[PDB]
Enzyme design. Structure first.
Site, PDB file in Angstrom:
ATOM      1  N   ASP A 233      -5.160  24.963  22.810  1.00  0.00           N
ATOM      2  CA  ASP A 233      -5.845  25.901  22.610  1.00  0.00           C
ATOM      3  C   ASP A 233      -5.906  26.677  21.415  1.00  0.00           C
ATOM      4  OD1 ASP A 233      -8.798  27.231  21.728  1.00  0.00           O
ATOM      5  OD2 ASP A 233      -8.166  29.414  23.006  1.00  0.00           O
TER       6      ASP A 233
ATOM      7  N   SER B 163     -14.911  22.908   4.516  1.00  0.00           N
ATOM      8  CA  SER B 163     -15.702  21.677   4.812  1.00  0.00           C
ATOM      9  C   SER B 163     -16.395  21.310   3.755  1.00  0.00           C
ATOM     10  CB  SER B 163     -16.523  21.188   6.503  1.00  0.00           C
ATOM     11  OG  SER B 163     -17.075  20.297   6.120  1.00  0.00           O
TER      12      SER B 163
END
EC number: 3.4.23.22
Length: 330
Positions: free
Chosen positions: A35, A199
């Site tokens: 994770d 992004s």
């Protein structure tokens, strides 16, 4: 040194991925959820409330000759999906795919919440975010990657998750045969303890690319792709019959639909998520309404590039002095 381990979907929907981890002496092998959105290595154990164990493999520290109780140490964690767990702490030897850390903090669960009990395939979590998020008290502990870093050939790990198929986590090296083209690297903020990046935008299917900054985290421990409501609305508008359902808890779509791809930007590069990756199947057994793999982050407080996004790429978690993230098509 290096390590390499195969990671396998827990079910037919890729709801999560499990990776075998060796703990203790003799080795006790547990299947852990790697994770990159958290920083605790915790396991089901011989100390876990018996009614809260239902098929998981447990760690028994009393059977490990290298286990040592970390005196006075406890841990307690709550995850974004509402689940939780807590307990005490041992140090022990932990190996992943041939890479060994001695003195790793292994957080032994005394209590777990119902969703963990109900998932017999996940024996615990291995956190790979930054150690600043580790919940051990009163002395915070380091992640497996942090403990291994100095010994690795290169201070990196990579995630190569498969679509409805096994994939690979590598530590200490970049497998140049595992991706196409080049790896595009992008800046990381560690200020919230996550692999947080920005992004450069998105496209829906064969649509034009929209240049826009989307701050989010690279999170292998989250199943879906959580993005701003505007972006998500633009995606599902291209699917006849798709709607946001308050009762179900997100966007659903007719199971008869063919889903468009979703592209996200990494600098000037582009990662394409095929439409099929965005299908998470009937909302309930036998339903012709299907759950979407792209959902709104509104009210999460952060955008999350979860497995739906990451499995479309070869992803480098670069733990150099100044961390960065790398993405390649594959």
């Amino acid at each position: 040194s290096t390590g390499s381990a195969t990671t396998t979907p827990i079910d037919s929907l890729d709801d999560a991925y499990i990776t075998p981890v060796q703990i203790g002496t003799p080795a006790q092998t547990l299947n852990l959820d790697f994770d990159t959105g958290s920083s605790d290595l915790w396991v089901f154990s011989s100390e876990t409330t018996a009614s809260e164990v239902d098929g998981q493999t447990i760690y028994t520290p009393s059977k490990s000759t290298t286990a040592k109780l970390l005196s006075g140490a406890t841990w307690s964690i709550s995850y974004g999906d509402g689940s939780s767990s807590s307990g005490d702490v041992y140090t022990d030897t932990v190996s992943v795919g041939g890479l060994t850390v001695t003195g790793q903090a292994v957080e032994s669960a005394k209590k777990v919440s119902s969703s963990f009990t109900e998932d017999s395939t996940i024996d615990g979590l291995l956190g790979l975010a930054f150690s600043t998020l580790n919940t051990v008290s009163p002395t915070q502990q380091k992640t497996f990657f942090d403990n291994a870093k100095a010994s690795l050939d290169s201070p990196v790990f990579t995630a190569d998750l498969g679509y409805h198929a096994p994939g690979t986590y590598n530590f200490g090296f970049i497998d140049t045969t595992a991706y196409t083209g080049s790896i595009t690297y992008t800046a990381v903020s560690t200020k919230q303890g996550f692999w947080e990046w920005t992004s450069t935008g998105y496209a829906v299917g064969s649509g034009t690319f929209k240049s826009t900054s989307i701050d989010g985290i690279a999170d292998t421990g989250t199943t879906l792709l959580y993005l701003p409501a505007t972006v998500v609305s633009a995606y599902w508008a291209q699917v006849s019959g798709a709607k946001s359902s308050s009762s179900v808890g997100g966007y659903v779509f007719p199971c008869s639909a063919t889903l468009p791809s979703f592209t996200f930007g990494v600098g000037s590069a582009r990662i394409v998520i095929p439409g099929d990756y965005i299908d998470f199947g009937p909302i309930s057994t036998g339903s012709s309404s299907c759950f979407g793999g792209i959902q709104s982050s509104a009210g999460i407080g952060i955008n999350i590039f979860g497995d739906v996004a990451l499995k479309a790429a070869f992803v480098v978690f670069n733990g150099a002095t100044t961390p960065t993230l790398g993405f390649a098509s594959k």
